[PDB]
Ligand binder design. Structure first.
Ligand code: SF4
Ligand code: FES
Lengths: 73, 108, 96
C-alpha cells in the first residue's frame, strides 16, 4: 500500500461527507480511486491516525480507510 | 475561561448541524468540552482529549484528530461520546449544555 | 487568475496574492502568516473570519448556517477568493 496505488473499496464503508450525499449515509463500496496518502508520520514525528489510507475519488471527494477496507489493483 | 465558551458554542452548533446529540449523561459531555478547550488553549487546536498521543504538537499539525476529527466528519464516529446519533443507545435528546454544568467540571 | 486578499489580523494588516484555485488559509500560510485552524474541512469555527469587502466561494463549508453566512463570516480553510477582498481573521469569538 504505497502512495499512488489505485485501490478499490471492497468493504462496506458508510460516510456522510459525500458532495452528492451531504449529511446522508452513503456506502462507498465499489468505488475505485488512488491512495493520496498513508498517514503514519508528520516530518519524522509519529502520528496516531486509525484510518491512515487516504483515497481520492471522482472530482472533489476523498476519504480515509482502514487497510482491510480497500484492495490493491 | 473564554476558550471554554468557544468550545461549548461549537459543540452545541455542530451537534445541530450534524443532527447528532449529547450523551444522556451530560457529565460525560462536559468532560469532553473541558478537554477540547484545554487542548485548544495549549496547542491552539481543539485536539481530541479522550486519547493518548506520543507527540501532540505533530498530531495537531496532521489535523486527523482535531475536533471534529476525520472519523466524526466522515463516519459520524465520535469516540469521546461527545456527538451521538439519535440511533445510539447512550444518545440523549439534548444538544445544549448549561454553562454551569461545565464550570462544575473545571472544578476538578 | 489571482486576487488580492487583504487580511486583517490582531497583529495588523497584511496583503497577499491568493489564486482563485487556492484556499484563503493555504494562501495565507504561504505568505508566512499564522492563522488558526482545526479540521481544515469547514466543519467547525476555529478558522472563522469575516468578509468586510469583496466576495469568496466557500461552498465546501458546512458548519456555518445561513444567518451567519449572510452576516459575513467565512471558513478560511475552505474559502476561495471570488475577487479582491478584505477578510478579518481570528473572528470565532464574534461568531456566537
Ligand atoms: S472523537 Fe472526534 S468528534 Fe469526538 S470529541 Fe474527539 S475529536 Fe471531537
Ligand atoms: S478548520 Fe474547521 S472549519 Fe476551517
Amino acid at each position: 500500500m504505497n502512495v499512488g496505488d489505485r485501490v478499490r473499496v471492497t468493504s462496506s464503508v458508510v460516510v456522510y461527507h459525500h458532495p452528492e450525499h451531504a449529511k446522508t449515509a452513503f456506502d462507498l463500496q465499489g468505488m475505485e480511486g488512488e491512495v493520496a496518502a498513508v498517514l503514519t508520520g508528520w516530518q519524522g514525528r509519529p502520528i496516531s491516525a486509525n484510518l491512515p489510507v487516504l483515497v481520492k475519488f471522482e472530482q472533489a471527494f476523498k476519504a480515509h480507510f482502514r487497510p482491510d477496507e480497500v484492495t490493491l489493483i | 475561561a473564554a476558550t471554554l465558551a468557544a468550545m461549548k458554542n461549537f459543540a452545541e452548533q455542530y451537534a445541530k448541524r450534524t443532527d447528532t446529540y449529547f450523551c444522556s449523561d451530560l457529565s460525560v459531555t462536559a468532560v469532553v468540552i473541558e478537554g477540547l478547550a484545554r487542548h485548544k488553549e495549549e496547542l491552539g487546536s481543539p485536539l481530541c482529549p479522550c486519547r493518548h498521543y506520543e507527540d501532540k504538537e505533530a498530531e495537531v499539525k496532521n489535523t486527523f484528530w482535531n475536533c471534529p476529527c476525520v472519523p466524526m466528519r466522515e463516519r459520524k464516529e465520535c469516540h469521546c461520546m461527545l456527538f451521538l446519533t439519535p440511533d445510539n443507545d447512550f444518545a440523549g435528546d439534548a444538544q445544549d449544555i448549561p454553562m454551569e454544568t461545565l464550570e462544575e467540571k473545571k472544578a476538578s | 487568475a489571482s486576487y488580492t486578499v487583504k487580511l486583517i489580523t490582531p497583529d495588523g494588516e497584511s496583503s497577499i496574492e491568493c489564486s482563485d484555485d487556492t484556499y484563503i488559509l493555504d494562501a495565507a500560510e504561504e505568505a508566512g502568516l499564522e492563522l488558526p485552524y482545526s479540521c481544515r474541512a469547514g466543519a467547525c469555527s476555529t478558522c472563522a473570519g469575516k468578509i468586510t469587502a469583496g466576495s469568496v466561494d466557500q461552498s465546501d463549508q458546512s458548519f456555518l448556517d445561513d444567518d451567519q453566512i449572510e452576516a459575513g463570516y467565512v471558513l478560511t480553510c475552505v474559502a476561495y477568493p471570488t475577487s479582491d477582498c478584505t477578510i478579518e481573521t481570528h473572528k470565532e469569538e464574534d461568531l456566537y
